[PDB]
């Protein structure tokens, strides 16, 4: 989520992803903890037998019959964490997320309440106003010619500088605002 994606997945990453998926679905099949531990150790033993294989062709031929075997026995109703993209509470609290700029439209009678919070907000606004002008030139000078090759951003390198494009990452509403 936070990390920028790569142009492709290597063989090692794909093997790790299959290992994680197979372990999760085996846990879903084996409800009890001792049975899951036994079958997960057996799965690891079956999994690391071809660890030391060297040539690329047989390695690519493997993991493929493995994916087919996984798909045949994939437990059509796996366990999902409640906050996961398939969980029972994936986007439960997304209706309580209000943007930060909404506070700029509050009535002065409303802004009379919470004066310290709005003073701090104004300080943050000033900081952002200066930091953006620094960041535009910093990113212009740091970017390779012809456009970026990946969606990864550089950190700040000077003393008073802030990381480029930081305002909408730092000022996330919350995980559970209400």
């Amino acid at each position: 989520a936070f990390s920028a994606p790569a142009a492709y997945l290597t063989h090692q990453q794909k093997v790790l992803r299959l290992y994680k998926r197979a372990l999760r679905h085996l846990e879903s099949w084996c409800v009890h903890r001792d049975k899951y531990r036994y079958f997960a150790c057996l799965m690891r033993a079956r999994f690391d037998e071809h660890k030391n294989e060297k040539d690329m062709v047989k390695a690519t031929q493997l993991l493929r019959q493995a994916e087919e075997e996984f798909w045949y026995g994939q437990h059509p109703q796996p366990y999902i964490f409640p906050e996961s993209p398939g969980g029972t509470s994936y986007e439960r609290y997304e209706c309580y997320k209000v943007p930060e700029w909404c506070l700029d439209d509050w009535h002065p009678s409303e802004k009379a309440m919470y004066p310290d919070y709005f003073a701090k907000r104004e300080q943050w606004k000033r900081l952002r106003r200066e930091s953006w002008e620094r960041e535009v030139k910093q990113l212009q000078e740091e970017t390779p010619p012809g456009g970026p090759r990946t969606e990864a951003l550089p950190p700040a390198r000077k003393e008073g500088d802030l990381p480029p494009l930081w305002w909408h990452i730092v000022t996330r509403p919350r995980e559970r605002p209400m």
Partner: protein, 128 residues
């Protein structure tokens, strides 16, 4: 060996079952690299226009404008009368009308014949 999964239109093929991803060539890697390059350029432009404190409006999206324009206003100038278009238009615009006309005409002729013959038993039928 295990039973094979057969994809369909509404149940597509899984990504991990694509033989294409296993056929790796330098051209494929270069294509993926330039795909992510253009994606990163678009993301950079969007974030640059998004994090700007000066902007106080809607970021215009040319892709959305093109989508709406193609869906609504670009249809007729690209229309060409062909046997396919003519036949489909005639069917989908004339067939239902005549089908429903036949159905309702037959039903009403039957009802009128029964009324004239008097065997319909319309007792208590006051509001129409």
């Amino acid at each position: 060996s295990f039973p094979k999964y057969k994809p369909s239109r509404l149940a597509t093929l899984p990504a991990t079952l694509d033989p294409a991803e296993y056929d790796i060539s330098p051209e494929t890697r270069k294509a993926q690299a330039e795909r992510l390059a253009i994606r990163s350029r678009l993301k950079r432009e969007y974030l640059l226009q998004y994090n700007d404190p000066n902007r106080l409006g809607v970021i215009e999206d040319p892709a959305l404008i093109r989508w709406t324009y193609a869906r609504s206003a670009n249809i007729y100038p690209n229309f060409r009368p062909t046997p396919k278009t003519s036949l489909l238009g005639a069917l989908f615009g004339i067939g239902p009308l005549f089908f429903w006309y036949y159905v309702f005409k037959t039903d009403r002729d039957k009802k009128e014949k029964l009324i004239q013959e008097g065997k319909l038993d319309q007792t208590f039928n006051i509001s129409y």
